[PDB]
Amino acid sequence: PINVAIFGSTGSIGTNALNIIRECNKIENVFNVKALYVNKSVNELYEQAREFLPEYLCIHDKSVYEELKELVKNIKDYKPIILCGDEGMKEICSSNSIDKIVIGIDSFQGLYSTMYAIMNNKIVALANKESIVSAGFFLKKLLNIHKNAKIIPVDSEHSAIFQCLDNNKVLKTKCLQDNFSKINNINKIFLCSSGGPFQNLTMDELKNVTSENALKHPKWKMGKKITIDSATMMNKGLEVIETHFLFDVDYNDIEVIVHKECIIHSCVEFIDKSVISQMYYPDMQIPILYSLTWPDRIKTNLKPLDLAQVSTLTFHKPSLEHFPCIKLAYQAGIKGNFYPTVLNASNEIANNLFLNNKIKYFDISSIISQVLESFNSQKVSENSEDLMKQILQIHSWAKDKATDIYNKHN
Amino acid sequence: PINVAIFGSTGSIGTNALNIIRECNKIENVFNVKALYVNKSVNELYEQAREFLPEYLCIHDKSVYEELKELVKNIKDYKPIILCGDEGMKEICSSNSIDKIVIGIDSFQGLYSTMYAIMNNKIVALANKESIVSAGFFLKKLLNIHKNAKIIPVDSEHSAIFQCLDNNKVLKTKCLQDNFSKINNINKIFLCSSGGPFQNLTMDELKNVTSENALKHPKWKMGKKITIDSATMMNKGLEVIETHFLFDVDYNDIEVIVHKECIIHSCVEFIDKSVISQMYYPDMQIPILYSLTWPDRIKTNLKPLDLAQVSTLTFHKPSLEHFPCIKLAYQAGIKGNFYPTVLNASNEIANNLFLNNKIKYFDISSIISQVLESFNSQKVSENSEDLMKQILQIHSWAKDKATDIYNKHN
Ligand SMILES: CN(O)C(=O)C[C@@H](CCCc1ccc(C(F)(F)F)cc1)CP(=O)(O)O
Ligand SMILES: CN(O)C(=O)C[C@@H](CCCc1ccc(C(F)(F)F)cc1)CP(=O)(O)O
Ligand SMILES: [Mn+2]
Ligand SMILES: [Mn+2]
């Protein structure tokens, strides 16, 4: 059986992971959910524990630890190891009974748990694209040291790319390693984008779009931060950098393409110019499942793709004048060093300012551009601990700079 | 260095094979063309010999054998082994200096050379779909005896399918082996079709179509027989049976889909319902190249696919009323036994009758249907030589039966 831990089990990735695990386990007993980890949703964790009966339970907030203990007594024939905080997370990571960890936690705590999963030579199913963009150097360093640790991408486009690769080649290397693209014969990547809600608007129309316009009737309903990033196409920008780090593909060989039907999830061009693509309805269960079954596939009861019904698939180039966040992402990535950290941090501030109606659409890219122009390359620490501190300092600096730019003009 | 023999080196498959070998070798010396075999095109073979300098030359037609020997004296520093006929073909297949054999011959000499390549445990790049459809049983039996022989598909759709599979799984099985689909986690196949030159005709327009209409202003350049098969969609009918035999996919799990843009070459749905597809411009060099590089890929200088420029990809279900040959192919495949042999043989006659303006469009399917109805299933011979003779007998019977049906109605 596949022994899986779910970190952030009540979030979007965590619940979709448990859903597909549930459905697949009805067809064949494939997964043992060995651990669940949440911040403070003690009741939701209890309900999950009642169904999945994991060996480990962990709650980050120590204040609800005793409440969890008492709730779990209601479940019969069940004596779990109940843990608290960072120390509990670390103990789960060190368990030789856990094979794979799904990290569905946002921000630093996602990176922190990823770090410990890697340090224990686990397979890490990673959805947090901001952690790859911001701390890619650090992750690459850790993966070079901990040879059996692997990051498997869960972001749908990156899963699609990963699914397009020959595992006879993938098994000779791993993601976030030098020469990954050479070993896999990768020439170029088509990174498919929905294009977001503003995809046909004029420059003058874009001047006055609000966050309500971005958040109005989503094609796929998702969190506010990513929805704003989808509207500016900074989501794709971040994903370009993620692609570069995960697959060691040069920026000149990554093309963003707008595919509004969201059936083709991305494509890989190999060195012979043959192109392989992965296709399905827009359903996050496939990328999550593949991250847990790789290098194998298992049966699901998901609806089969009806291509004749789908009927038409369309592709066009995004306009970088209309979606300048894409250009800024490429520029930051190509500059290298900690520019991607700066891009991510300044976008965090600009995204949130636009979300709360404090700035306009082109102010997002304006602020990010100014923060990038103010950053000076730093010597990259050789010490792993100093490197992590360096990333956090630069992240903090960039957020402050974005905020100061906003404060000067307001 | 990949040591290759090309059988039928002046036909379409052969010349495209030599073109891509030439272009790839300019990038990196990967291929040695060890042998070239033609029927009677002695001057063309000489010109190829002058460039590629193969160890072996073979010409089927004894009457130009001496002319070939005299022509080859003009080539500097070159002492090839110059051979004739079936015996020359057999000697090439048995050479320890040949790894891979491209079968670019139609008719029987195709099946005949395929057999000898398999008997010598070679990798056989097989383009002749009629051979698989007609003698699939025999090929399976032979591959079970000669366990190191492998058939690698060159037919573009079947290459596409093969390219969509994980070689970590493919390497544990082989084409035309029982359980190929199970080992590769294949659930279903989308077999993509151009739709042919008659795809948009009304029923009334179809009743009056001639071979001239099929052969005029082609979308892509190809032979008369296959062009007629594309027009009736019997080409796709044959390819359904080819798919079943190559990949051990059930007929209920093979779907023919009309994709008029000819960019997606076919798709594989896996047991999780994830779909993988292979895409390129319609250029036969990719499938030929992959058959020779599998399980690896090599660099080419082919034009990269510009998806944005392609812009739109479309899919629809073919009409079985307009294209009854598709239905007849499924029926023959599902009934099994030697019905595919009968389908292929009767089609050979009906195709040629329509080509030469002797019968009308719907007479093609009428004749094939009548021959299929006439056939009586036979006990499948256990001995492989007895089985080959049985296939040949049934093939001859079915051609004669089709011909007699024509002669009665004429
Ligand atoms: C899903 N995903 O990984 C995203 O980044 C969101 C993306 C796609 C939204 C639509 C969608 C949702 C889910 C999926 C799924 F389920 F296949 F992952 C595909 C497509 C927005 P954009 O491409 O404009 O940057
Ligand atoms: C190419 N091929 O394998 C055919 O069977 C001919 C096919 C496709 C003709 C156009 C074409 C030519 C070459 C290629 C290539 F490059 F993929 F080989 C794809 C498509 C006709 P239909 O699908 O209607 O039965
Ligand atoms: Mn994504
Ligand atoms: Mn074909």
User: For residues B365 and B325, is the Cβ–Cβ distance under 8 A?
Assistant: yes
Cis status, amide bond into A295, omega within 30 of 0: yes
Provide the β-strand partners of residue A103.
A7, A126
DSSP A122-172: -EEEE--HHHHHHHHHHHHHHHHHSTT-EEEE-SHHHHHHHHTS-HHHHTT
For chain A, say whether B277 makes contact (Cβ under 8 Å): yes
DSSP state of B316: B
Asked if residues B246 and B176 have their Cβ atoms less than 8 Å apart, the reply is yes
DSSP state of A98: -
Q: Give, in degrees to the nearest 5, the angle at Cα B155 between A163 and A298.
A: 30
- Residue B282 in contact with ligand 2 by CB distance below 6 A: yes
CA distance A401 to A341: 13
Q: Are A315 and B311 in contact (CB < 8 Å)?
A: yes
> What is the rounded CA–CA span in Å between residue A13 and residue A7?
9
Closest-CA distance, A258 to chain B, in angstroms, reads: 9
Under a CB-based contact definition with an 8 Å cutoff, are residues A237 and A350 in contact? no
Q: In ligand 1, which atom is closest to the CA atom of A283?
A: 16
Sign of the alpha-carbon torsion through B373, B376, B379, B385? negative
With the most atoms of ligand 2 within 8 angstroms of its CB, the residue from B163, B194, B235 to mutate is: B194
- Interface with chain A: mutation pick from B257, B307, B312, highest number of A CBs within 10 Å: B307
Structure tokens at A296: 């194998």
Q: Is any atom of ligand 2 closer than 6 Å to the C-beta of B230?
A: yes
Which of A15, A158, A191, A222 for mutating ligand 1's site (highest number of atoms within 8 Å of CB)? A222
The full DSSP string for B376-409 is ---PPPSSHHHHHHHHHHHHHHHHHHHHHHHHHH
> Does B297 lie at the interface with A, CB-CB under 8 angstroms?
yes
Left (φ > 0), alpha (ψ -120 to 50) or beta: where does B315 sit? beta
Angle at the Cα of B402 from the Cα atoms of B399 and B407, rounded to 5 degrees: 120
The count of residues in chain A is 410
Amino acid identity of residue A410, one-letter, is: N
For residue A242, the ligand closest to its alpha carbon is 3
From the list B134, B56, B123, B132, the residue with the least C-alpha distance to B90 is: B56
User: Is there a contact between B194 and B266 (Cβ–Cβ < 8 Å)?
Assistant: no
Burial grade of A115 (CB within 10 A; 0-12, 13-18, 19 or more): buried
Does the annotation flag A335 for ligand binding? Answer: no
Instruction: Considering only the beta carbons, identify the residue of B257, B279, B299 that sits closest to A277.
Output: B279
> Whose CA is closest to A18, among A35, A40, A39?
A35
Distance CA B263, CA A387 (A): 46
In chain A, residues under CATH classification 1.10.1740.10 are 320-410
Number of A–B residue contacts, CB under 8 Å: 145
Backbone angles phi, psi at A101, to 5 degrees: -125, 125
To one decimal place, what's the resolution in Å? 1.6
CB atoms within 10 A of CB B26: 11
Q: Find, in chain B, the residue whose alpha carbon is nearest to that of A171.
A: B168
The C-alpha torsion from B1 through B7 and B8 to B10, rounded to 10°, is 20
Atom of ligand 2 nearest to the CA of B283: 16
Ligand 1 within 6 A of CB of A365 = no
Question: Contact B352/B399 with Cβ under 8 angstroms?
Answer: no
B307 touches chain A (CB under 8 A): yes
Q: For B390, what's the count of Cα atoms within 13 Å in the CB-facing half-sphere?
A: 18
Ligand 2 atom, smallest distance to B156 CA: 3
CA distance A91 to A319: 48
CB A151 within 8 A of CB A175: yes
CA distance A190 to A180: 17
Residue B182, chain A, CB below 8 Å: the answer is: no
The reply to whether A171 touches chain B by the CB within 8 Å rule is: yes
Whether B322 has a binding-site annotation, put simply, is no
Among A183, A219, A173, CA closest to A199:
A219
Looking at residue A252, the DSSP 8-state letter turns out to be G
Any atom of ligand 1 within 6 Å of the Cβ of A318: no
Find out if CATH 1.10.1740.10 is the number for domain A320-410. Answer: yes
Q: Is A393 left (phi over 0), alpha (psi -120 to 50) or beta?
A: alpha
With a CB cutoff of 8 Å and minimum separation 6, the contacts of A349 are: A367, A399, A402, A403, A406
DSSP string, B94-138: H-TT--EEEE---HHHHHHHHHHHHHTT-EEEE--HHHHHHHHHH
One-letter identity of residue A224: K
Written as six digits, the tokens of B55 are 């160890």
- Tokens for A393, please give them: 């300092």
The closest-lying atom of ligand 1 relative to the alpha carbon of residue A281 is 17
The class level of CATH for A1-155 reads alpha beta
Q: Is B235 in the pocket of ligand 2 (CB under 6 A)?
A: yes
Query: Which of B185, B279, B305 is the closest to A297 by Cβ?
Result: B185
3-state helix, strand, coil in chain B (%, to 5): 50, 15, 35
Note whether B27 contacts A: Cβ–Cβ < 8 A. no
Please enumerate in sequence order all residues whose Cβ is within 8 A of that of B305, keeping only pairs 6 or more positions apart, or say none: A269, A273, A275, B263, B279, B280, B281
Closest CA to B128 of B105, B99, B97: B105
Give the number of the ligand closest to the Cα of residue B326. Answer: 2
| A268/B contact by beta carbon, under 8 A | no
Q: Measure the CA–CA gap between B333 and B133, rounded to whole angstroms.
A: 9
Alpha carbon distance A361, B14 (integer Å): 57
Question: Do residues A183 and A172 touch, judged by C-beta distance below 8 A?
Answer: yes
User: Does the beta carbon of B128 sit less than 6 angstroms from any atom of ligand 2?
Assistant: no
Taking the centre of ligand 1 as the mean of its atom positions, its distance from the CA of residue A383, in whole angstroms, is 36
Distance CA A169, CA A135 (A): 26
DSSP string, B231-279: HHTHHHHHHHHHHHHHH---GGGEEEEE-TT--EEEEEEETTS-EEEEE
Cβ–Cβ under 8 Å, residues A258 and A199: yes
Q: Which of A307, A309, A310, A314 is the best residue to mutate to test the B interface, defined by the most B CB atoms within 10 Å of its own CB?
A: A307
B252 in contact with A at a CB cutoff of 8 Å?
Answer: no
**Ligand 2 and B315: CB distance under 6 A:** no
Rounded to whole angstroms, the Cα distance separating B322 from B320 reads 5
User: In 3-state terms, what secondary structure has residue A116?
Assistant: helix
- N-terminal to C-terminal alpha carbon distance within chain A: 57
What is the rounded CA–CA span in Å between residue A308 and residue B86? 47
Q: Please answer whether residues A261 and B132 qualify as being in contact, where contact means their C-beta atoms are separated by less than 8 angstroms.
A: no
Cβ of B305 less than 6 Å from ligand 2: no
What does each C-alpha distance from B375 to A186, A260, B201 come to in angstroms?
Answer: 51, 51, 32
Contacts of A380 (CB under 8 A, 6+ apart): A137, A337, A338, A387, A390
CA-CA distance, B260 to B282, in Å (whole number)?
11
For the record, the structure tokens of B16 come out as 């495209």
How far is Cα A367 from Cα A349, in angstroms, rounded to an integer?
9
Residue A319, chain B, CB below 8 Å: the answer is no
Which positions in chain A touch B161 (Cβ < 8 Å)? none
**Tokens matching residue B202:** 């009304």
CA distance B289 to A315: 28
Cα separation, A306 vs B269, whole angstroms: 11
Nearest by CB: B277 against A279, A286, A298: A279
DSSP run (H or E) holding B344: helix B339-355
Question: Which of B271, B273, B298 comes nearest A305 by C-beta?
Answer: B273
CB A12 within 8 Å of CB A105: no
Residue A195: count other Cβ atoms within 10 Å of its Cβ. Answer: 22
Q: A258 and A242 in contact (C-beta within 8 Å)?
A: no
Q: Where in chain B is the domain with CATH 3.40.50.720?
A: 1-155
A113 CB contacts (<8 Å, ≥6 apart)? A7, A37, A89, A93, A101, A103, A105
Annotate B142-177 with three-state secondary structure: HHHHCCCCEEEECCHHHHHHHHCCCHHHHCCCCCCC
**B10 vs B42: CA distance, rounded Å:** 10
Residues A372 and A323: beta-carbon distance below 8 Å: no
How far lies A326's CA from each of A248, A369, B49, B167, in Å? Answer: 19, 11, 53, 35
Ligand 4 center from residue B99 Cα (angstroms): 25
Ligand 4 center–CA A315 separation, angstroms: 26
Structure-block tokens of residue A319: 């306009």
CA B395 to centroid of chain Cα atoms: 18
Are A390 and A380 contacting, i.e. CB atoms less than 8 angstroms apart? yes
Per-residue DSSP letter, B322: T
Q: Is the CB of A261 under 6 A from ligand 1?
A: no
Instruction: Reduce the DSSP state of residue B304 to 3 states and report it.
Output: coil
* Tokens at A213, concatenated: 């316009």
The count of C-alpha atoms lying within 13 angstroms of the C-alpha of A355, restricted to the half-sphere facing its C-beta, is: 14
